[PDB]
Scaffold this active site. Structure first.
Site, mmCIF file in Angstrom:
data_model
loop_
_atom_site.group_PDB
_atom_site.id
_atom_site.type_symbol
_atom_site.label_atom_id
_atom_site.label_comp_id
_atom_site.label_asym_id
_atom_site.label_seq_id
_atom_site.Cartn_x
_atom_site.Cartn_y
_atom_site.Cartn_z
ATOM 1 N N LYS A 155 -9.811 1.113 -1.917
ATOM 2 C CA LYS A 155 -9.895 0.581 -0.555
ATOM 3 C C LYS A 155 -11.257 0.778 0.102
ATOM 4 O O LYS A 155 -11.770 1.893 0.170
ATOM 5 C CB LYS A 155 -8.796 1.204 0.308
ATOM 6 C CG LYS A 155 -8.620 0.577 1.685
ATOM 7 C CD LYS A 155 -7.457 1.263 2.392
ATOM 8 C CE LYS A 155 -7.169 0.648 3.736
ATOM 9 N NZ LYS A 155 -6.061 1.410 4.356
ATOM 10 N N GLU A 174 0.851 -1.172 0.000
ATOM 11 C CA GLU A 174 0.000 0.000 0.000
ATOM 12 C C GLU A 174 0.898 1.236 0.000
ATOM 13 O O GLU A 174 1.980 1.222 0.602
ATOM 14 C CB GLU A 174 -0.869 -0.015 1.264
ATOM 15 C CG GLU A 174 -1.780 1.204 1.477
ATOM 16 C CD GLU A 174 -2.498 1.175 2.827
ATOM 17 O OE1 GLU A 174 -2.032 0.458 3.745
ATOM 18 O OE2 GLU A 174 -3.532 1.872 2.976
ATOM 19 N N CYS A 177 -4.656 -3.660 3.191
ATOM 20 C CA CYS A 177 -4.434 -3.266 4.592
ATOM 21 C C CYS A 177 -5.462 -3.482 5.634
ATOM 22 O O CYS A 177 -5.714 -4.693 5.754
ATOM 23 C CB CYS A 177 -3.886 -1.895 4.725
ATOM 24 S SG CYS A 177 -2.866 -1.659 6.130
#
EC number: 3.5.1.128
Lengths: 303, 296
Positions: free
Chosen positions: A123, A41, A165
């Site tokens: 995300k 990321e 993440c």
């Protein structure tokens, strides 16, 4: 067997310097004959605050264009194909701005050997957490949440499910990716020290065992240099507000569908490094055959 | 702080002998001031095969009734309340038989200090792995959250632990504590037992209780073997269970664990901290951050 590369790095606020590191890692990956390379990321940049993030995101499209070219150059010069999965940021769209949303997109790009972007996964679960004995972090101040479940990518390694993440903490997401046909999951991350030490290895192994997938964990590592004198000048920032001590966990790894760690970053280096693993489709199929979890779900009760 | 006891034991095919062990463990839990004691899957019996199980399940209702009396006896003798969570089997009902479902039920009972059965949870996910569904019928319902002396309890069995959506649903329903009474194999135990418990705890921000069967079982039953006119070549009386019973906090820390050097039945104790649970949930508000628009 299919060869994967997983990169560990330490992003600064300088996109030119970050690109150089990224290019070197991809170059090494091709030299080691990895079919796909996975980078963390925020491999384009990390920022000091939400205003800095918006400023840097304006530079990311050029970073991406340069990366696309670099990939095709490397493929040409090595007479060998590679695909690249990499976390970046993108500025808001016109439609976003029209709706009063000037936040950046936290995006996982999949780029093929021809430099073609196949997917931009935005995300879904943003990092809004009061870190135990640590800072209050609110990603949603700089980043806008995605509104789409990412499609399964038919990669040279097999069927790929993408995540970023904090996405890793929401098991229903990984379950959905497997349900759609994933054989491999990735969780490119910039993970904190405090939660990293506690949960990084646990969560990666858990997701692998839950879904009977290989799990790839490309992580940021080390103390990030977030300095940006030109932006600090423009923003009229005092040296008092200039220091930024963000640190990431690292411990990048590859995990098999039984939860065994088969590749792991060397803890002796806090600079960029590449780890390699060979993925075994027959092992994955054997594991799924012996414990047919996806034939045993109670869809009549759950979902 | 509220005190939990988690029991580790080793069932034979003898329900009378198993009952004695269960009663001793409940007695020990009361002596140690536990407010609820959790015992493993199949604490009434383990069987050699499906035909053996159907035979032993006919004996299970008496086991349960005797256990109900024993709990009220122990509470009254010791002058202290305890609730009991315990895995047992039940024979098919008369209606089940008429419907062609001649299979036993793998059930988790919650029995309060009055000896009353507050919940009968029938296992939802059956252990068919390289076949439990040969002897066992799957459950029809998600179990209600139980308002236990320790807090809000979500119940599951064994293989259930492998399906994260189940644990996530129990948390959505309000669970603060999850239990996974089990008879876990050695091979998957070594690999996954601790991993899965810790993962479910971290996933759900719940205390996780892991009562397991332990050691080498002897499932011999000469009376059944004679009645079945069984040949010695067909006996299947050995089983091995992983043990490693534990209590896990909502952050994934193991706060109590079975002593590996102790052979046979043992209790582990933990004091649960509701304020710790609340702090973890406040700092990382996962249930305010789910994408129900896309997943639920």
């Amino acid at each position: 067997l299919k060869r994967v590369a997983v990169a560990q790095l330490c992003s600064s606020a300088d996109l030119t310097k970050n690109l150089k590191v990224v290019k070197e890692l991809i170059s090494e990956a091709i030299q080691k004959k990895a079919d796909v390379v996975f980078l963390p990321e925020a491999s384009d940049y990390l920022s000091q605050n939400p205003l800095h993030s918006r400023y840097l995101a304006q530079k990311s499209p050029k970073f991406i264009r340069q990366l696309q070219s670099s990939i095709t150059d490397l493929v040409r010069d090595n007479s060998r194909n590679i695909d690249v999965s990499i976390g970046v940021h993108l500025p808001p769209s016109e439609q976003d701005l029209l709706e009063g949303n000037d936040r950046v997109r936290n995006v996982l790009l999949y780029i093929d050997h021809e430099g073609k972007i196949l997917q931009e996964y935005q995300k879904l679960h943003l990092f809004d957490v009061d870190v135990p004995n640590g800072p209050i972090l609110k990603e949603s101040k700089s980043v806008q949440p995605g509104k789409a479940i990412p499609d399964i990518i038919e990669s040279p390694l097999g069927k790929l499910g993408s995540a970023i993440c904090y996405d890793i903490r929401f098991p229903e997401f990984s379950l959905k990716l497997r349900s759609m046909g994933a054989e491999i999951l990735c969780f490119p991350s910039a993970f904190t020290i405090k939660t990293g030490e506690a949960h990084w290895e646990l969560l990666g192994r858990a997701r692998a065992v839950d879904t009977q997938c290989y799990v790839l964990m490309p992580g940021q590592v080390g103390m990030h240099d977030l300095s940006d004198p030109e932006w600090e000048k423009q923003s009229h920032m005092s040296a008092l507000e200039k220091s930024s001590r963000r640190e990431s966990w690292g411990h990048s790894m590859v995990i098999d569908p039984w939860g065994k760690i088969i590749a792991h970053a060397d803890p002796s280096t806090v600079g960029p490094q590449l780890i390699l693993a060979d993925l075994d489709r027959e092992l994955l199929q054997e594991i799924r055959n012996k414990m047919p979890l996806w034939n045993q779900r109670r869809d009549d009760l759950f979902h």
